[PDB]
Design a protein around this ligand. Structure first.
Ligand SMILES: *[C@@H]1O[C@H](CO)[C@@H](O[C@@H]2O[C@H](CO)[C@@H](O[C@@H]3O[C@H](CO)[C@@H](O)[C@H](O)[C@@H]3O)[C@H](O)[C@H]2NC(C)=O)[C@H](O)[C@H]1NC(C)=O
Ligand SMILES: *[C@@H]1O[C@H](CO[C@@H]2O[C@@H](C)[C@@H](O)[C@@H](O)[C@@H]2O)[C@@H](O[C@@H]2O[C@H](CO)[C@@H](O)[C@H](O)[C@H]2NC(C)=O)[C@H](O)[C@H]1NC(C)=O
Ligand SMILES: *[C@@H]1O[C@H](CO[C@@H]2O[C@@H](C)[C@@H](O)[C@@H](O)[C@@H]2O)[C@@H](O[C@@H]2O[C@H](CO)[C@@H](O)[C@H](O)[C@H]2NC(C)=O)[C@H](O)[C@H]1NC(C)=O
Ligand SMILES: *[C@@H]1O[C@H](CO)[C@@H](O)[C@H](O)[C@H]1NC(C)=O
Lengths: 68, 214, 107, 149, 218
């Protein structure tokens, strides 16, 4: 493909990011380590995991479980 | 196009290691996963492990302690290594393409039979079964081999509908099976009927023409 | 929805901080009448605003706009004789003077 | 295959073309791309300027008051998708006050996944009536294409 | 740890009937992000590798007949075959591919058919086997239904139990019948020590056995 309809992972167009990957910027699949590197590069947005997405901040009513 | 084929040793000595190679074509190992699944004789499918596009692996929590899965992206081949096999590891081993994120395991290898035993690899003696004095049934006795499996074809696969290849029976660390073919009387013995038997483990392939009796 | 469009025009308003062509410095007026222009012809009009001329002009980014003049009444009317020749083989060579100055060009 | 080159972040390129070369190796812009307020640029500056690696923009593409630029056919010949994850006032593509632009020329643009198109006040701009936007956007109802040549 | 449980262990049905089978997972296989179930159904015909039938619990794989329908969500899933074909004879497995992969125990689908008498064939040892010092007398009992059959060997009119090996094939993919081989192995010397060899088959189809025999001498 020149571009993907859904998500991009490992040189392939995929329907969803399967576990243990996370949906990033609504177009690519990233691993935990990548999301972790973004978070620590801030320590802007310190990236978090929610609903199988690597996102800039926790949604309303939620807080960062620091570790994971 | 999409293909996977397992290259195993077929017989492993108890407490020794098993090594298998799955060679693939028609897709890149960088974009797809490859899983290993085994099937013990007359049992179900057991998932062993998987190797993702990015080389990271997942293993079955049982077999994790003695199982390795690696690959060589450039050679399009995936490797399984299993430490200290026992009787219960005797099974057919399959490698299967995992188009993760889109489909589950879709393309499966034909499988590779692994027998865990102390017994020696023995090639079969192939005997033609012609009937004594509409349709005619002929046969082929494949006797005294080890380990399973044997492949039986008739006229290199030209004959198929009238074929029945019976499960082998193990007697005294040696297997025996028989295969029958039913053909029209007009076609035999006027036209040749040959039984083709291969025993990969012994690297033997023999042909037995079924010859009429006097 | 109209206040999403309002703020849009306003976004660029806020983003907004040698050769010679015929021109005119328009004093105490907010209109111009450009005379002596070719019939049914388009023009590139660059308009600027100035708050100094004396010690070097201090002017505005251009406001670019384009317009085509109206055409003439008989500009495209062919004149002079429609002339003809007839060859030995009865082929008719018709001849006419093309309209020297038309409304754009003759297609 | 898919994306060979880099994923680059969004950019706001103003005044001069210097920073534009930062897009050199991007196959994907993960953000928006704004090119604006280049008053001293001339066609000569664009004649040998091309980003053939750029296939996709996740947000929006905006071009405002870029002088000397007559087409985008050589700048973004292979730009195929504008996802519109983030928009500029509901628009995924904005072409505004592009004095000198004669055509868009984004001949590989196949889909605008979210958002609309705003193409306004480009006095030399043609090859708009020739684009069937219904093949590129689900809804053309919200497009605003006016005051162009 | 995701456990997959299938029911029933097996079922028998005649061609044309509807069939339903269950698959239950210990954990929900429903992915929040796409509201799809990470569940698949595979078909494994005898002696073949498994074939993907359904994924996402309900999406039918390319080239899969419309007869097959997957339904269910979360933890409870069903595979339905609207009108079973003779060719559908196989073991059906469900697999979760949510995180790692787990297969269910499988549901074996068998076919019910009209009763059929076996075709019996008897074969004396090969001259090649005799040259090697062995002697196997083979009897084939092909294309019969139901599976239960009884084969009796007679040597010189008297019943022989010792040294007989029997093997049944899997149910046939086209006619839904069974076949079986019965091999009586003797030494060449022991073989040459008798004249008449008989293979008698008793099936529900007849009260009188189907008999095949031969005389070594002939
Ligand atoms: C441009 O590409 C997309 C690729 O999927 C084509 O499909 C459209 O895809 C979007 C998502 O990328 C769909 O939008 C979604 O709609 C649901 C409601 O139905 C809503 O809940 C989501 O938030 C989102 O807005 C859209 O429905 C879908 N439309 C169609 C007709 O498939 C799109 O059609 C392509 N357009 C062209 C002209 O090529
Ligand atoms: C987890 O991810 C990192 C980073 O992934 C890279 O960036 C992604 C956006 C995408 O482009 C991936 O395909 C990239 O691999 C992994 O680190 C990389 O590992 C490869 C070898 O596999 C190495 O050649 C790269 O240089 C590494 N890049 C970086 C930025 O570190 C990392 O291996 C992953 N870890 C696991 C356990 O999967
Ligand atoms: C665009 O890429 C070229 C080539 O380098 C690649 O990109 C690097 C980021 C890295 O991944 C390399 O392994 C790749 O090969 C860059 O040009 C080269 O730059 C290096 C120093 O970084 C220099 O030694 C080389 O001589 C340069 N070669 C050429 C042909 O220019 C270039 O700078 C990158 N530009 C941008 C904006 O990313
Ligand atoms: C480009 O603009 C910057 C200021 O943004 C200036 O410092 C630089 O010298 C300029 N370079 C050129 C080549 O115009």
């Amino acid at each position: 493909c020149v571009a993907c309809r859904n998500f991009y992972l490992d040189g392939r167009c995929v329907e969803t990011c399967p576990p243990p990957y996370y949906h990033f910027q609504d177009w690519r699949c990233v691993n935990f380590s990548f999301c972790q590197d973004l978070h620590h590069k801030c320590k802007c947005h310190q990236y978090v995991i929610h609903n199988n997405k690597c996102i800039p901040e926790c949604p309303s009513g939620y807080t960062m479980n620091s570790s994971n | 196009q999409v293909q996977l084929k397992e290259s195993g040793p077929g017989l492993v000595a108890p407490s020794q290691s098993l090594s298998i190679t799955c060679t693939v074509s028609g897709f890149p190992l960088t974009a797809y996963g490859v899983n290993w699944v085994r099937q013990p004789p007359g049992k179900g499918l057991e998932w062993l492990g998987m190797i993702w596009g990015d080389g990271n692996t997942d293993y079955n929590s049982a077999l994790k302690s003695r199982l390795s899965i690696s690959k060589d992206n450039s050679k399009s081949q995936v490797f399984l290594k299993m430490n200290s096999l026992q009787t219960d590891d005797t099974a057919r081993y399959y490698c299967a393409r995992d188009p993760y994120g889109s489909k589950p395991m879709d393309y499966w290898g034909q499988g590779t039979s692994v027998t865990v035993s102390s017994a020696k690899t023995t090639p079969p003696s192939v005997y033609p079964l012609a009937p004594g004095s509409s349709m005619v049934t002929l046969g082929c006795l494949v006797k005294g081999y080890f380990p399973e499996p044997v492949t039986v074809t008739w006229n290199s696969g030209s004959l198929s509908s009238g074929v029945h290849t019976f499960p082998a029976v193990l007697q005294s660390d040696l297997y025996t099976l028989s295969s029958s073919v039913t053909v029209p009387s007009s076609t035999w013995p006027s036209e040749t009927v040959t039984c083709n038997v291969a025993h990969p483990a012994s690297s033997t392939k023999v042909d037995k023409k079924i010859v009429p009796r006097d | 929805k109209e206040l999403e469009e309002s703020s849009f025009r306003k976004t660029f308003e806020d983003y907004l901080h040698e050769e010679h062509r015929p021109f005119e410095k328009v004093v105490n007026k907010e209109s111009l009448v450009i005379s002596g222009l070719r019939h049914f012809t388009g023009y590139r009009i660059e308009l600027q605003a100035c708050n100094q001329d004396t010690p070097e002009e201090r002017c505005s980014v251009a406001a670019y706009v384009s317009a085509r003049t109206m055409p003439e009444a008989k500009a495209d009317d062919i004149v002079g004789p429609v002339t003809h020749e007839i060859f030995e083989n009865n082929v008719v060579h018709l001849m006419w003077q093309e309209p020297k100055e038309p409304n754009g060009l003759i297609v | 295959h898919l994306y060979p080159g880099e994923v680059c972040p969004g950019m706001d390129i103003r005044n001069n073309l210097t920073r534009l070369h930062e897009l050199e190796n991007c196959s994907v812009i993960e953000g928006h791309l704004q090119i604006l307020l280049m008053f001293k640029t001339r066609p000569e500056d664009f004649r040998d300027l091309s980003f053939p690696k750029l296939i996709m923009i996740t947000d929006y593409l905006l071009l405002f008051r870029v002088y000397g630029l007559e087409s985008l056919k050589d700048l973004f010949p292979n730009l195929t998708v504008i996802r519109g994850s983030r928009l500029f006032f509901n628009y995924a593509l904005v072409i505004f006050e592009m004095v000198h632009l004669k055509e868009l020329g984004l001949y590989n643009l196949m889909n605008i996944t979210r958002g609309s198109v705003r193409i306004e006040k480009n006095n030399e701009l043609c090859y708009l009536a020739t684009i069937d936007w219904s093949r590129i956007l689900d809804s053309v109802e919200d497009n605003h294409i006016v005051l162009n040549k | 740890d995701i456990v997959m449980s299938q029911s029933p262990s097996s079922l028998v049905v005649s061609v044309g009937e509807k069939v339903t089978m269950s698959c239950k997972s210990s954990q929900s296989l429903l992915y929040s992000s796409n509201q799809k179930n990470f569940l698949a159904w595979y078909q494994q015909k005898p002696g073949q590798s498994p074939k993907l039938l359904i994924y996402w619990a309900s999406t039918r794989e390319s080239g899969v007949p419309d007869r097959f329908t997957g339904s269910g969500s979360g933890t409870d899933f069903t595979l339905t075959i609207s009108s079973v074909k003779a060719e559908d004879l196989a073991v059906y497995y469900c697999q979760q591919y949510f995180r790692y992969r787990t297969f269910g125990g499988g549901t074996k689908l068998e076919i019910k058919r009209a009763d059929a008498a076996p075709t019996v064939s008897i074969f004396p040892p090969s001259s090649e086997q005799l040259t090697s010092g062995g002697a196997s007398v083979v009897c084939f009992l092909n294309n019969f239904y139901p599976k239960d059959i009884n084969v009796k060997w007679k040597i010189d009119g008297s019943e022989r139990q010792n040294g007989v090996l029997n093997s049944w094939t899997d149910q046939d993919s086209k006619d839904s019948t069974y076949s079986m081989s019965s091999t009586l192995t003797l030494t060449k010397d022991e073989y040459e020590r008798h004249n008449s060899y008989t293979c008698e088959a008793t099936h529900k189809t007849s009260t009188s056995p189907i008999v095949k025999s031969f005389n070594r001498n002939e």
